[PDB]
Symmetry: D2
């Protein structure tokens, strides 16, 4: 069964659990030198994010098999997740492909914005925009992080107009915050502590996207890069 109850995560496998005291000190891995003074610790290293995404791709391929689907990348934060996912889905599909096979997925991009500093503004700005080509298609939303769940509730509501066949959700990180509205993903990488994360395409006011590991930003970082 292809998931089609967005926010319910009806048949989702557990994520990897990153415990409240888990993580690694900054001297454990390569950290760009200028970023070190703004980070408290490494939560999830680049290579483990990548290994987990490979398995997610495998889970997605096991669900869709050869049914055409359309993957929708929420820019900008989902870039890292999306690129690793495309790499691993492609290799898994194409390694098992035979002469009578066909392409597994199409790729689409929507820019959505809602954060300022370390907080949801509670509003969602969307830029795409003709998603009518998605009518009657299976779509897989690819999102970097579910926090409040507000982005995904609002975007899923917004997708209703295009008369898409199914909407499934894949999300790299879910944060254990009391602010969460209950929105669950269908494929989920990691459950993480309630702290604002940066790295692997996740930014704090556009900073730290290029940081390879998922890290916690410290108060000096939040202060230095605050919105002005």
């Amino acid at each position: 069964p292809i998931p089609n109850n967005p926010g319910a995560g009806e048949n989702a496998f557990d994520p990897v659990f990153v415990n409240d005291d888990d993580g690694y000190d900054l001297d454990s891995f390569m950290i760009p030198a200028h970023y070190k003074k703004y980070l408290t610790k490494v939560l999830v290293p680049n290579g483990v994010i990548k290994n987990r995404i490979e398995k997610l791709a495998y889970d997605i391929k096991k669900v869709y098999n050869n049914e055409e689907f359309h993957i929708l990348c929420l820019l900008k934060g989902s870039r890292g997740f999306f690129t690793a996912l495309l790499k691993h889905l492609s290799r898994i599909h194409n390694y098992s492909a035979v002469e009578t096979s066909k392409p597994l997925f199409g790729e689409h991009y929507v820019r959505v914005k809602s954060y300022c500093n370390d907080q949801s503004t509670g509003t969602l700005e969307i830029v795409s925009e003709d998603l009518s080509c998605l009518k009657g298609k299976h779509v897989l939303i690819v999102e970097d992080i579910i926090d409040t769940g507000k982005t995904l509730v609002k975007f899923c509501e917004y997708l209703k107009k295009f008369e898409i066949k199914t909407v499934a959700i894949a999300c790299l990180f879910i944060k254990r915050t009391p602010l969460w509205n209950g929105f669950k993903a269908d494929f989920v990488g990691f459950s993480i502590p309630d702290h604002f994360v940066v790295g692997y395409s996740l930014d704090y006011n556009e900073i730290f996207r290029d940081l390879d590991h998922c890290c916690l930003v410290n108060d000096e970082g939040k202060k230095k890069y605050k919105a002005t």
Copy 2:
């Protein structure tokens, strides 16, 4: 100096030249089984594309040094180029960074559409976030291929309204076609023969983006996947 004469390629290094008789048997490399019947030959393998992009990253870092710039990815065709470019630019910058360094680039996305089948429709569809956030910034346009030169000439005209400080162009492929209007990039990967190429994010009607190598689509493929 930082380039600022879009289409002139005033100080550009030569690309790698791929001669008209260059390329490789489809049995030389891994090719997804179902695509083989639709391809003539491999032109540039994945790995050499990646090795060329690393050097282009290096070239870009040598020009900009530590001067902040903003990279504009032209979707969807530029995804593969842009992701490898980001990977290598980040490693090169962050490897040489020191505690007093800062981030080198910001990232932006513009969806730009003009082709149908193997030819330009001669019009250009543009969708992105509001580009006035680029005012007074150094901008680097990242494009997959210059063919007719129409996309870039029109897109650069359009950027004239935003009061950007400089506009430089990085292009992965330039096609030696008599249809070319003369638009030159500032950083260029490969010069290629006059044939419609697919793979490495370049499509024919949304097909073959997931193909890892740059290949020539054959007449059977053009017919099978024709717009209808």
Copy 3:
């Protein structure tokens, strides 16, 4: 600063100025469904202890630490086969990139490479004897040598090996080790660069084997009782 203390280690077994490894707790790890595991191995594994990507990221940092120590001084890397293969090739890849990225026209190559096959394990236990396939190491006379070893467990392999090296009149002997196990049987031999401290359980993957099996497993995992039984020598 380098004028006050020469950074290249020269007290093998002492780990005189070693950074601490990443500490992996006994209850740390992941179930087998969290990552890619070859389907036929799953029945023989308890859990993933350290994922492949963590190991690779750690090794990049070790490369960095090694480059900071040796700077521009030529040294010779000595790979203890077969188990050190994964560690060693990751280490070379990263050392070469870090060195070659910062190199200038007047720079020079940083390291030579060398291989020795040494063997001591049967099943999950050291036999207490080290077999060395002798190879002509006199090319190491008066050179800085860095031994690259997958895992320190009892420490017997490395004490016996450093003893064998004495005859070659090497200039310095430093040790890099991917894993050190917190076994009560450890003789106290410490590495100069160490990746991870792990609990006292028999691990496989990332080139580490149980009787030649599991070297191709990408993640460091614990072999279970059924695996130990199935692949018993």
Copy 4:
């Protein structure tokens, strides 16, 4: 030709009985040194890039595929000829393991064992016509399928002598994988069963291939120039 009609595992070492042709690299093929990343200090000693790193890796993935299609699920033992085959061998293992383990099911088995032998014969850019051999006891290869993994066939002397040495061990089959074969008029006709590239008769360095222990860390296969041969002369 189906597997019940002809057994695919090669067993006529030196004959390359059913080998796919290699990628052919022409004498005038290649790239300027500013085309790719080259360690700044090597550039004065190199003439051009002949085969870029990424091309080699992609080729090796296809060799892994070809090898997996041949052996299918039968256990074989890979024998890495040190030091020069390191690059080839580690890329080959990475891809072979992924191809095998991606298609593996619950009842599958491991595909290969790995073994190492140090062999040596070159001084400067020429074969010395003698071969030094160092390894573990290879009697563990008795009755096994073995695949020798070799960086480069040039005169073919290393491999004729090595295969002759192997005879004492009563191995079941001996197949050869080789990354480069050089079109040298000195070639004794020893052919590999799986071969990556055919290259012109010039001394190459990079991708683990050395000139007197130098250039192994160079990522791309390049030609060493005369200054390089002079500077790093034995």
